[PDB]
Amino acid sequence: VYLDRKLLTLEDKELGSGNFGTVKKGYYQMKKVVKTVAVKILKPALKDELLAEANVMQQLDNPYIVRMIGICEAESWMLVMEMAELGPLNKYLQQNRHVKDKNIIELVHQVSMGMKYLEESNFVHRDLAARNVLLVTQHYAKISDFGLSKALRADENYYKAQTHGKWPVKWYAPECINYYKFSSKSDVWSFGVLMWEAFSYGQKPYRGMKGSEVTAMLEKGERMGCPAGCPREMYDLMNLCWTYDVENRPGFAAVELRLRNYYYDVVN
Ligand SMILES: Nc1ncnc2c1ncn2[C@@H]1O[C@H](COP(=O)(O)OP(=O)(O)NP(=O)(O)O)[C@@H](O)[C@H]1O
Numbered sequence: 603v604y605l606d607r608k609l610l611t612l613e614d615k616e617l618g619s620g621n622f623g624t625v626k627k628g629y630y631q632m633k634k635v636v637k638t639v640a641v642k643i644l645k646p647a648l649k650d651e652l653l654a655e656a657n658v659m660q661q662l663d664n665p666y667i668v669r670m671i672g673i674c675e676a677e678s679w680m681l682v683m684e685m686a687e688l689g690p691l692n693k694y695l696q697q698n699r700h701v702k703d704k705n706i707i708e709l710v711h712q713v714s715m716g717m718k719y720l721e722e723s724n725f726v727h728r729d730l731a732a733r734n735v736l737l738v739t740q741h742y743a744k745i746s747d748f749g750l751s752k753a754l755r756a757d758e759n760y761y762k763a764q765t766h767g768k769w770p771v772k773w774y775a776p777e778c779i780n781y782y783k784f785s786s787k788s789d790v791w792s793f794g795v796l797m798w799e800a801f802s803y804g805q806k807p808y809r810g811m812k813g814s815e816v817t818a819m820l821e822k823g824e825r826m827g828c829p830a831g832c833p834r835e836m837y838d839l840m841n842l843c844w845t846y847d848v849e850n851r852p853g854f855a856a857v858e859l860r861l862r863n864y865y866y867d868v869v870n
């Protein structure tokens with residue numbers, strides 16, 4: 603089942619670009635309302651990758667995950683998604699230093715809610731970073747980019763990668779680097795890095811370090827420090843996400859609960 607090209611209107615300007623091609627803003631005529639959308643436009647593996655991305659998104663339904671409207675094929679093969687007007691979380695915080703810690707807590711908590719749902723759904727994101735969190739409003743975040751995502755088999759709690767590819771190593775847990783094992787707990791490690799990025803206002807983690815130097819740092823039990831003005835309770839949570847041993851590392855249910863309670867304590 604596909605979208606009708608005649609019901610899609612594209613704006614010529616591009617929101618982004620990838621190896622696949624470009625991302626463009628558009629409008630899709632729904633039953634009555636016209637919906638603003640973001641469209642990934644493919645320019646053979648590139649097509650297989652986008653189709654696998656669509657296959658994952660088709661199965662997800664959560665307020666904190668970017669929804670796929672559908673696939674459209676006419677002059678080009680297209681992946682139609684809902685539009686997150688404010689763009690990537692890292693770029694937004696870089697340009698909006700006035701954002702309060704309470705607001706950052708709210709957004710990272712929303713990411714933890716989407717990840718809690720992903721974990722329950724038995725999918726591993728594998729690219730959970732601040733650049734992949736898209737903002738609908740300054741108070742509404744959604745997880746995007748299911749390009750490296752995997753639906754875990756009914757009998758396993760991890761996805762085993764064959765060989766090391768183009769990996770975002772700085773966001774990867776030690777078992778990913780060492781055993782090529784990807785689980786919801788490895789996404790928890792990435793979520794810790796994402797939290798650090800968010801409280802650092804979109805600064806890059808492990809500044810000026812090579813991937814191998816990051817692995818060597820973590821193996822010595824060393825971790826990134828507390829970002830300037832970051833609540834200590836949030837830094838403690840990042841360190842819990844960065845638990846070396848996968849078995850002792852918390853899952854998204856524990857992480858979301860810790861975040862939820864801390865946010866409501868701040869509200870109180
Ligand atoms: N659903 C969406 N809503 C709003 N903007 C989007 C959406 N999807 C993608 N974009 C924009 O397009 C950019 C690139 O898309 P992305 O999913 O990151 O693909 P990519 O292959 O990783 N390209 P790049 O980030 O440059 O390495 C994002 O950083 C957003 O600015």
Ligand SMILES: [Mg+2]
Nearest residue numbers: 620733734747
């Ligand atoms: Mg990208």
